[PDB]
Design a protein around this motif. Structure first.
Motif, PDB file in Angstrom:
ATOM      1  N   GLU A   1      46.333  44.336  32.368  1.00 46.98           N
ATOM      2  CA  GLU A   1      45.357  44.358  33.455  1.00 46.98           C
ATOM      3  C   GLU A   1      45.859  43.539  34.642  1.00 46.98           C
ATOM      4  N   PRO A   2      45.575  44.002  35.852  1.00 47.16           N
ATOM      5  CA  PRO A   2      46.032  43.343  37.075  1.00 47.16           C
ATOM      6  C   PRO A   2      45.827  41.838  37.106  1.00 47.16           C
ATOM      7  N   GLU A   3      44.644  41.365  36.714  1.00 51.68           N
ATOM      8  CA  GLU A   3      44.388  39.929  36.856  1.00 51.68           C
ATOM      9  C   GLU A   3      45.314  39.053  36.033  1.00 51.68           C
ATOM     10  N   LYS A   4      45.678  39.482  34.827  1.00 54.91           N
ATOM     11  CA  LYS A   4      46.511  38.642  33.968  1.00 54.91           C
ATOM     12  C   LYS A   4      47.998  38.924  34.092  1.00 54.91           C
TER      13      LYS A   4
ATOM     14  N   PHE B   1      49.406  35.252  31.282  1.00 53.29           N
ATOM     15  CA  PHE B   1      49.666  35.417  32.707  1.00 53.29           C
ATOM     16  C   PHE B   1      51.160  35.466  32.984  1.00 53.29           C
TER      17      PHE B   1
END
Ligand SMILES: O=P(O)(O)OC[C@H]1O[C@](O)(CO)[C@@H](O)[C@@H]1O
Ligand SMILES: O=P([O-])([O-])O
Ligand SMILES: [Mg+2]
Ligand SMILES: [Tl+]
Ligand SMILES: [Tl+]
Ligand SMILES: [Tl+]
Ligand SMILES: [Tl+]
Length: 329
Positions: free
Chosen positions: A100-103, A83
Motif C-alpha cells: 500500500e502507498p502509505e507504507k 516502511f
C-alpha cells in the motif's frame, strides 16, 4: 557481557559513515522480529499443533504446511509495517505483493518464509531465506521490480532453525553470522566476515535421482567416491533442507548440488527466493554458485517462481564440476 553487538548495531554501524535513509536497518529489524516469532513457533510446534498441512498448494507444486501459512503471514506483516519495501515476492504467493502507498519503502524483498518442508514433521533443521533488491524503476511498483538478476542483490541471507537459531547476513562487503540469544530475543554477532574454504571434503546431493542425473553429475559423484589420485573419498551429507545443507557448506566447505536432471531441465529450487540469496551469500564468502553452465546471479528471470539448477560451495569443488560439464559440452 554488558556490551552486545546485535544485528541492529552492526547494520547501523555498517551503513553509518556511508549514511543512508536507514530503511535497510528498519527492514532487517522487522525481519528479525518475524524470524524470532517463527523460531518460537518451531521450537514448540508439536505442542502448539503446528505440524500438519494447510490444505493448499503453492504456485508450481507444494503441499502447504501450517507453519508455511504462519511464517508467511508474519514475514509479510512485518515487512509491510517496516516502511522500507514496495514489492514482496513469496514462495507462498502466486503473484507479487504490492505494498500500500502509505507504507511503501524502496526495497523489493523476495523470500521463502519457511524452507525445508519435507523435514518439518521429523524435526530436522528448517529455515527462512530472503533476497533484498533496491527498486530501480521510477514507475509504479510491480512484479517486474522483482525480475532482477541476483547480481543486483543489496542484501541476502537466511534464518536457520537448527540446534541453535542463526541469522546469516550477506551484504556488499561480506558475510556475517548472528546467533539468536533466546533469553533476550536479540540476534548477536558470533561470526564476522565469513569465508568458505577453497576446497572441502563433503559432497551433498540427493543421490536418489542418480537415474536422471546428467553424465557430468554422474561422473563427479563417482570421482568423489573413487578419487583418481588415491586421496580420501569425500564424505556424504544431505540433510534435505537447503538452508541447513548450505550453511554446513559455508562453515565446513565443500559442495551442495541440486542440478538439472532428465526430468527437470531447470532443477527444482526457486531462483528468486532460494537460489539467488544462497548464490549471493556464497559469493560474498569467496565461493561459487552455478547452474553447471552459467553463474546463478547472472540469470535474468522472467517468472517470479522460476526454477534454477544450482551448484555451490568451495570454488575449487565447484570448478572441478564445471570442468566436467565443459568436457561434456
Ligand atoms: O527431496 P529433495 O528432492 O531432495 O528436495 C530437497 C530440497 O527441497 C527443498 O525443501 C525446497 O523445496 C529444499 O529445502 C531442499 O534442499
Ligand atoms: O517448502 P519449501 O520451502 O520449498 O521447502
Ligand atoms: Mg517454503
Ligand atoms: Tl511452500
Ligand atoms: Tl516449508
Ligand atoms: Tl522448491
Ligand atoms: Tl518450493
Amino acid at each position: 557481557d554488558t556490551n552486545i553487538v546485535t544485528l541492529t548495531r552492526f547494520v547501523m554501524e555498517e551503513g553509518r559513515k556511508a549514511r543512508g535513509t536507514g530503511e535497510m536497518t528498519q527492514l532487517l529489524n522487522s525481519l528479525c522480529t518475524a524470524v524470532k516469532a517463527i523460531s518460537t513457533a518451531v521450537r514448540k510446534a508439536g505442542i502448539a499443533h503446528l505440524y500438519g498441512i494447510a490444505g493448499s498448494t503453492n504456485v508450481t507444486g507444494d503441499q502447504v504446511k501450517k507453519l508455511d501459512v504462519l511464517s508467511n503471514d508474519l514475514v509479510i506483516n512485518v515487512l509491510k509495517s517496516s516502511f522500507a519495501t514496495c514489492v514482496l515476492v513469496s514462495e507462498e504467493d502466486k503473484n507479487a505483493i504490492i505494498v500500500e502507498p502509505e507504507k511503501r519503502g524502496k526495497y523489493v524483498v523476495c523470500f521463502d518464509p519457511l524452507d525445508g518442508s519435507s523435514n518439518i514433521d521429523c524435526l530436522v533443521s528448517i529455515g527462512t531465506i530472503f533476497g533484498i533488491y533496491r527498486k530501480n524503476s521510477t514507475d509504479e511498483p510491480s512484479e517486474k521490480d522483482a525480475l532482477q538478476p541476483g547480481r543486483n542483490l543489496v542484501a541476502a541471507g537466511y534464518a536457520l532453525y537448527g540446534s541453535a537459531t542463526m541469522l546469516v547476513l550477506a551484504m556488499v562487503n561480506g558475510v556475517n553470522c548472528f546467533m539468536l540469544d533466546p533469553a533476550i530475543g536479540e540476534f548477536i554477532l558470533v561470526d564476522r566476515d565469513v569465508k568458505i574454504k577453497k576446497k572441502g571434503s563433503i559432497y551433498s546431493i540427493n543421490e536418489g535421482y542418480a537415474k536422471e542425473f546428467d553424465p557430468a553429475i554422474t561422473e563427479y559423484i563417482q570421482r568423489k567416491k573413487f578419487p583418481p589420485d588415491n586421496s580420501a573419498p569425500y564424505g556424504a551429507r544431505y540433510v534435505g533442507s537447503m538452508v541447513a545443507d548450505v550453511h554446513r557448506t559455508l562453515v565446513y566447505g565443500g559442495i551442495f548440488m541440486y542440478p538439472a536432471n532428465k526430468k527437470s531441465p531447470k532443477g527444482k529450487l526457486r531462483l528468486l527466493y532460494e537460489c539467488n540469496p544462497m548464490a549471493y551469500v556464497m559469493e560474498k564468502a569467496g565461493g561459487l554458485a552455478t547452474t553447471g553452465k552459467e553463474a546463478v546471479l547472472d540469470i535474468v528471470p522472467t517468472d517470479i517462481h522460476q526454477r534454477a539448477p544450482i551448484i555451490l560451495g568451495s570454488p575449487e569443488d565447484v570448478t572441478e564440476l564445471l570442468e566436467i560439464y565443459q568436457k561434456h559440452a
